[PDB]
Ligand binder design. Structure first.
Ligand SMILES: [Ca+2]
Ligand SMILES: [Ca+2]
Ligand SMILES: [Ca+2]
Lengths: 75, 157
């Protein structure tokens, strides 16, 4: 499954995943590719926050679904 | 009607995202606020508090304590942090503590405001934007995120 992750800058990361994979695993994939630690990343699908201990099939995320990586802004 | 022509994708109940393409200086006036660590609140105090002062930011931080008591337990960006209300207020109400996305969400709820954070590239071109609230953008509070480290106020021109 080629899911897309959308960021605030508009950057898009295509991840190869399996429906059984957990959000924690998806966060670990993004960490290895972009260096963003999983504690600092909010995955969001259809306006809802995704919990680490749950799977993609539970949130009904499919082949070309696009999640959102929303980062904490401080200044 | 460009800013109104901007389309926002909902990533929370109170939060939306967008990928706009424009230079913030063409549509906004930048009011630079000091690099004291309290500029998020300094940039909000310029746009919201009618009486301008070097200590108007404190009034914004005090309004934030009421807002955190009301909404921090139920805020999505607060579920990520391992912090609970009393820790957050001690950390956040301190001087040189950086405010931003989490603080803007609770303030938008408690003050009935729509807050838009525009992010720039070092040439004043927007790399992205976040809006807290779904109100009109001509009544919203406009904040500039220069780098990922600084906040200045924006007034519509
Ligand atoms: Ca001021
Ligand atoms: Ca009040
Ligand atoms: Ca962009």
């Amino acid at each position: 499954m080629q899911i897309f992750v959308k960021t605030l800058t508009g950057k898009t990361i295509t991840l190869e995943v399996e429906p059984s994979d957990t959000i924690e695993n998806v966060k670990a994939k993004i960490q290895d590719k972009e260096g963003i630690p999983p504690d600092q990343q909010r995955l969001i699908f259809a306006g809802k926050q995704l919990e680490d201990g749950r799977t993609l099939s539970d949130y009904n995320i499919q082949k070309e679904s696009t999640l959102h990586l929303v980062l904490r802004l401080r200044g | 009607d460009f800013l109104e022509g901007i389309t926002w994708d909902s990533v929370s109940d109170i939060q939306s995202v967008s990928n706009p393409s424009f230079t913030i200086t063409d549509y906004f006036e930048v009011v630079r606020q000091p690099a004291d660590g309290n500029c998020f609140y300094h940039s909000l105090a310029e746009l919201y508090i009618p009486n301008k002062s070097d200590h108007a930011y404190r009034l914004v931080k005090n309004e934030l304590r009421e807002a955190a008591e009301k909404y921090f337990p139920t805020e999505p960006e607060a579920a990520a942090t391992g912090m609970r209300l009393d820790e957050y207020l001690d950390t956040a109400l301190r001087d040189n503590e950086w405010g931003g996305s989490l603080e803007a969400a609770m303030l938008s709820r408690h003050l009935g405001l729509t807050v838009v954070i525009w992010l720039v590239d070092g040439s004043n071109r927007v790399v992205g934007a976040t809006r807290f609230g779904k109100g009109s953008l001509k009544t919203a509070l406009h904040l500039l995120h220069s780098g990922l480290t600084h906040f200045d106020a924006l007034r519509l021109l």
